[PDB]
């Protein structure tokens, strides 16, 4: 039993709940917070606009090292950092942007990368702001992790139709 209360079950592995993914990181401290983050680590606005403001932007500060030593990610690529105040370590993961006409079957690889974590809180990545299909989002999570997953999504009329349609 794990300390993420009021989750829909999904599957066998994937949970979901209508949140703020900033409000329930601060609440449970999980492991492994997700950024949807974008090649430059650069949190402006979205799900990583509002975890970096939570942090008081030290996220961003220590991004701007990660990205200075190393460069930028790779679309469907992701590095582990602090989670700072929010959870031990954010797996930042950069799904395709499709407003920007990238690849979106990156957004497979994209959540390749949560199958090196036993337990995560997400967002749907590729979604909202980066302008894919959130219901094909969830559909691409359930059908490539196998590690467990809980998944907060924060416009309710959105949480309802991804639940409504799921089946
Ligand atoms: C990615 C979308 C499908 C999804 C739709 O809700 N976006 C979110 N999901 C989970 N937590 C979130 N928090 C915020 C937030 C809080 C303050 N500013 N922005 C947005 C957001
Ligand atoms: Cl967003």
């Known amino acids: 039993v794990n300390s993420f209360s009021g989750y829909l079950k999904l599957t066998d592995n994937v949970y979901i709940k209508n949140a703020?993914?900033?409000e329930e990181a601060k609440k449970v401290k999980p492991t492994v917070v997700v950024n949807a983050a974008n090649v430059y680590l650069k949190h402006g606005g979205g799900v990583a606009g509002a975890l970096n403001k939570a942090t008081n932007n030290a996220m961003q500060v220590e991004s701007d090292d990660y990205?200075?030593?190393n460069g930028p990610l790779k679309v469907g690529g992701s590095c582990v950092l602090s989670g700072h105040n929010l959870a031990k370590h954010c797996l930042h993961v950069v799904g395709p942007?499709?407003?920007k006409g990238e690849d979106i079957q990156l957004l497979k690889s994209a959540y390749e990368n949560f199958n090196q974590h036993?337990?995560?809180l997400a967002?749907?990545?590729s979604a909202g702001i980066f302008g894919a299909d959130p219901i094909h989002s969830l559909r691409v999570?359930?059908?490539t992790v196998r590690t467990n997953v809980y998944?907060?999504?924060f416009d309710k009329n959105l949480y309802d139709k991804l639940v409504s349609s799921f089946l």
């Open 67 to 69: 990205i200075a030593t």
């Open 20 to 22: 703020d993914i900033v």
């Open 97 to 99: 942007n499709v407003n």
């Open 118 to 120: 036993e337990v995560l």
């Open 141 to 143: 999570c359930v059908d």
């Open 123 to 125: 967002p749907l990545l």
């Open 151 to 153: 998944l907060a999504v």
